[PDB]
Amino acid sequence: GSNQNNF
């Protein structure tokens, strides 16, 4: 799967 971290 694709992953996004919005810190």
Ligand SMILES: [Zn+2]
């Ligand atoms: Zn993945």
